Design a protein around this motif. Sequence first.
Motif, mmCIF file in Angstrom:
data_model
loop_
_atom_site.group_PDB
_atom_site.id
_atom_site.type_symbol
_atom_site.label_atom_id
_atom_site.label_comp_id
_atom_site.label_asym_id
_atom_site.label_seq_id
_atom_site.Cartn_x
_atom_site.Cartn_y
_atom_site.Cartn_z
ATOM 1 N N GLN A 30 0.890 -1.150 0.000
ATOM 2 C CA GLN A 30 0.000 0.000 0.000
ATOM 3 C C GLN A 30 0.933 1.206 0.000
ATOM 4 O OE1 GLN A 30 -3.863 1.816 2.432
ATOM 5 N NE2 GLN A 30 -2.331 0.614 3.547
ATOM 6 N N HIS A 31 0.992 1.897 -1.132
ATOM 7 C CA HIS A 31 1.859 3.059 -1.304
ATOM 8 C C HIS A 31 3.327 2.685 -1.070
ATOM 9 C CE1 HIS A 31 3.482 7.098 -1.231
ATOM 10 N NE2 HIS A 31 2.298 7.605 -1.524
ATOM 11 N N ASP A 32 3.754 1.609 -1.727
ATOM 12 C CA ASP A 32 5.127 1.091 -1.665
ATOM 13 C C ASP A 32 5.606 0.491 -0.336
ATOM 14 O OD1 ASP A 32 7.513 0.263 -2.855
ATOM 15 O OD2 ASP A 32 8.393 2.271 -2.987
ATOM 16 N N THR A 33 4.703 0.286 0.617
ATOM 17 C CA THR A 33 5.092 -0.327 1.884
ATOM 18 C C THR A 33 4.415 -1.694 1.968
ATOM 19 O OG1 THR A 33 5.182 -0.088 4.320
ATOM 20 C CG2 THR A 33 3.235 0.776 3.230
ATOM 21 N N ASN A 34 5.207 -2.734 2.224
ATOM 22 C CA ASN A 34 4.667 -4.090 2.314
ATOM 23 C C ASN A 34 3.768 -4.216 3.531
ATOM 24 O OD1 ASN A 34 4.248 -7.019 1.943
ATOM 25 N ND2 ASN A 34 6.298 -7.088 0.972
#
Length: 679
Positions: free
Chosen positions: A381-385
């Motif tokens: 979600q927005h480049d965060t795992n």
Amino acid sequence: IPEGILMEKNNVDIAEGQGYSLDQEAGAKYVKAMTQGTIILSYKSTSENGIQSLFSVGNSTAGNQDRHFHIYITNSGGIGIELRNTDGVFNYTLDRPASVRALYKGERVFNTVALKADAANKQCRLFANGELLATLDKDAFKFISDITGVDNVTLGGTKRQGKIAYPFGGTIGDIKVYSNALSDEELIQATGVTTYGENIFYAGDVTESNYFRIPSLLTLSTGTVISAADARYGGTHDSKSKINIAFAKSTDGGNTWSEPTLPLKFDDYIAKNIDWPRDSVGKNVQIQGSASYIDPVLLEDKLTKRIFLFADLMPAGIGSSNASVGSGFKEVNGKKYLKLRWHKDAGRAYDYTIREKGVIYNDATNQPTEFRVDGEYNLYQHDTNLTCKQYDYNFSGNNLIESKTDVDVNMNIFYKNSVFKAFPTNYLAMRYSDDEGASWSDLDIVSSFKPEVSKFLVVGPGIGKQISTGENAGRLLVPLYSKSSAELGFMYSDDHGDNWTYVEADNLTGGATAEAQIVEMPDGSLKTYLRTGSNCIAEVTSIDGGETWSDRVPLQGISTTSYGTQLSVINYSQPIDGKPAIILSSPNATNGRKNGKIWIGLVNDTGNTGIDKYSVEWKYSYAVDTPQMGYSYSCLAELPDGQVGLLYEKYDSWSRNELHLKDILKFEKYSISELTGQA
């Protein structure tokens, strides 16, 4: 009673039903009164009698037939003990099926077993061939001293009302009876003196699984032999469990194997070595909310040297029996994408899709969300795992408690606690490797073609097949089966595995377990042998590279059960008796998965065209062990030397009495000389 060896006897031949008296041994008076102790014996059974006592001590008098202690084996490889003084006083039993064997490579072989009655720990333990088989704990510890009116010490039978019961036939190589309880370590070493065949995967290795099933074995064009198997953590149950696919390779012709890896695995539930209960209640319990991989297929593209690993991919809590009918895909802009359900939406609202580059889309608006998936199908979600708590599982009595831990794992779309969940049907997954398993590609879900009318579309475990000659030379094929408009099916690739096409091989809607394997005929035509729900193995032929298949024809002369068992059939590179040959492995009993045999079929050209061009003469059969010995799934492989390797399940995987057994996946090798009875 003295400390140490109370009695020892060597090389005793026992005629079936006669037994052998040890009553005149100097230490019989001590043996008849043991309060605890250890019994270790080496034996060779030459009898088919159902239950065979190896050693017993008890009351032989009238009406006292239930007062005795004995260690016995069964003609089906089971082993156990019974410590009795009539049911109202005590009846302690302990056993483990498929623990010993009878014949190996044409000859009856010795097995070494041991029973340890440990008073200090109020525990009884059975060992056989280097393995700790089972343990029995009892607050009211009992042994021979507690049996009323003991009057005999016997080898090869149990005296009941003056008769030899549970008659053994064979040879007692040696028997040592100690008054003290030896260590498990001593007994493991002691019994480990006799072992047959080898293990590739084993309880205790780095896979962290106590159980294994569903063998896959394959020799690559380079000489390397690779293998795979289900690493079944929650006992031996089929999916709706925690199962990963394990992998190992040999670079020395099948002699030694590398440390196993897990190319296909999920982490929603922890991988750990756990002893699954085998009692009448707990044995039926299985993991409820874990995702899993099950049934491997190995295949090599001999042109590119690329290898592929396929397996069924089961979403959390799913197995074929409870898979939802549907493809799990949705078509948008004329292309099929994996469907997803936002966890806060209605239970059956799959309003999102995973599109190009793993971007998740809101189908309603046709706009991308702030979520995406990587090549492992783990969420971002927005480049965060995104992550979720991993589950642990433990038995609390007969109940299996599945509880969260504090361990964070990447949130995968196939997990029960994911914010975006995949449709609950089964999928077909695969990874490729250009370095013999050193590294594998990202997760490739190739089942976009799953019929929307199908409940499940799964693989036929074992190995795939690449056509080596004719118009379709190079085509890769993998056997499948389903509960759909077709039962038997296949998926093939003409572009070296990059893309796959599904083919319905029949119009059967019953969804029977039509596991099959494929062999190639001299001209490149194909014959597929499959399990059926009838009492026969069926054969179908293809003359167009696997695109169309003939109707099922029974394989005459090779018996099987009504429910059937997976089989292995492979091509052999050299002629046998001067003819092209194929080799088949399968249990041969008409009830129960047992009496495994390896058959050699010689290919004959009738000169007829099409489907009837070739006829296979199943000329040789080779019995792996005695008739009642267990034998289930298997996979053959032609090793670099002339040998035929065999990775198989040496037990009855159908029996509800043989669930959750460790060390049953064995690797053995046979020469053509042996297979053809030439020896």
